[PDB]
Ligand binder design. Structure first.
Ligand SMILES: Cc1cc2nc3c(=O)[nH]c(=O)nc-3n(C[C@H](O)[C@H](O)[C@H](O)COP(=O)(O)OP(=O)(O)OC[C@H]3O[C@@H](n4cnc5c(N)ncnc54)[C@H](O)[C@@H]3O)c2cc1C
Length: 353
């Protein structure tokens, strides 16, 4: 039995646990955060992402909890709506709860005898060549443990990644992009959806935009993507309401003015990083999946779905190369990296037609 340390019990980490569990590895997952089953909110799941769940027999489980989006609904500056179908049926996407997907994936990974969950454990440091990691439980005693394979599934700020990268003469490397994001809610109207549920709703503007995905509880979660330069200018409730009157006129009625002003100032806008690694593996000891390998901002694509495909492709290599990691890893890097727009920046011009 070969020993695997999966760093990160998020979306990709939990998925990968299931894939590896099928291959009779000894898998220990280490999640810094607490078990969410005791203790953004939406995502669009794609056809490609589905395939990965199906490969571990979770699809129908997760699909039943999801609301299908079969077209875009565009909200123009004037507050008018227009529908745009997806070309192919395979472009349909599914709105799913982030939290509950993570819950389901974790339970699925525990259904396996050879999987043990280690919550409230934060990788402080690791050694790739040495196959050793340094974790930290709540008891707060740095204990070091060895392993055969380290799977960096520890998200956009991967600690595993920080150890696999070299560190040049003068680090002229910006981490964050100039855009930030903020979540709002369109609540139900009369115990039902305040707009058309089976659409991805989009308020495209040039340098900023909002999107809305439906929830099972008959609300929509909004996400507003804006340069910090713009967020900076919205200091008061009056500023916010003014901004929304001017750029998202139909949104205020849907969200409600009070609710908007409350939720807008719960937190600063959340920053985002755009990174890609030259390689997703070290030797035969360490591989990166999900945002650890490629942190994809939503403007340029679909991070979860990409990470889920990471798992699928990795699993296909394992079949292909009979669990030989010396081969799977390097080939994984080579085959994934070359896998490269609903949320692009544009003005939407209303025509007479
Ligand atoms: C606003 C927004 C909207 C998005 N919408 C979509 C969408 O619609 N569709 C889509 O496909 N993608 C979407 N994405 C991308 C998607 O959220 C990510 O790409 C995806 O969650 C990556 O999954 P992951 O497992 O790699 O990382 P994560 O989900 O971030 O999980 C990483 C885990 O590692 C843990 N961890 C971190 N450091 C340590 C450490 N040192 N020790 C131990 N554990 C650690 C964290 O606690 C976390 O549980 C969106 C992203 C953003 C920011």
């Amino acid at each position: 039995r070969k020993k695997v340390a999966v760093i990160g019990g998020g979306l990709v980490g939990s998925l990968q646990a299931c894939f590896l569990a099928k291959r009779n590895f000894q898998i220990d997952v280490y999640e810094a955060r607490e078990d969410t089953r005791v203790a953004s909110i939406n995502l669009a799941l794609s056809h490609r992402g589905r395939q990965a769940l199906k490969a571990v027999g979770l699809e129908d489980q997760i699909v039943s909890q999801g609301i299908p989006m079969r077209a875009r609904m565009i909200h123009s500056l004037s507050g008018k709506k227009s529908a745009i179908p997806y070309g192919t049926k395979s472009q349909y996407i599914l709105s799913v709860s982030r939290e509950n997907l993570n819950k389901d994936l974790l339970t699925a990974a525990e259904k396996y005898p050879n999987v043990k969950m280690h919550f409230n454990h934060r990788l402080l440091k690791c050694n790739p060549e040495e196959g050793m990691i340094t974790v930290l439980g709540s008891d707060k005693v740095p204990k070091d443990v060895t392993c055969d394979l380290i799977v960096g599934c520890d998200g956009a700020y991967s600690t595993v990644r920080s150890h696999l990268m070299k560190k040049p003469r003068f680090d002229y490397s910006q981490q964050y992009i100039p855009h930030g994001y903020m979540e709002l809610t369109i609540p139900p109207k009369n115990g039902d959806y305040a707009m058309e549920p089976n659409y991805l709703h989009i308020w495209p503007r040039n340098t900023f935009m909002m999107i809305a995905l439906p929830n099972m509880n008959k609300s929509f979660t909004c996400t507003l993507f804006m340069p910090f330069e713009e967020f900076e200018k919205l200091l008061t409730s009056n500023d916010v309401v003014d901004f929304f009157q001017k750029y998202f006129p139909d949104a205020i009625p849907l969200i409600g003015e009070k609710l908007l002003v409350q939720d807008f100032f719960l937190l600063p806008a959340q920053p985002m990083i755009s990174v890609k690694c030259s390689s997703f593996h070290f030797k035969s000891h360490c591989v990166l999946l999900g945002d650890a390998a490629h942190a994809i901002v939503p403007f340029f694509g679909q991070g979860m779905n990409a990470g889920f495909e990471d798992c699928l492709v990795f699993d296909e290599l394992m079949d292909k190369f009979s669990n030989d990691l010396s081969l799977c890893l390097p080939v994984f890097s080579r085959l994934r990296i070359p896998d490269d727009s609903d949320l692009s920046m544009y003005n939407y011009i209303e025509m007479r037609a």
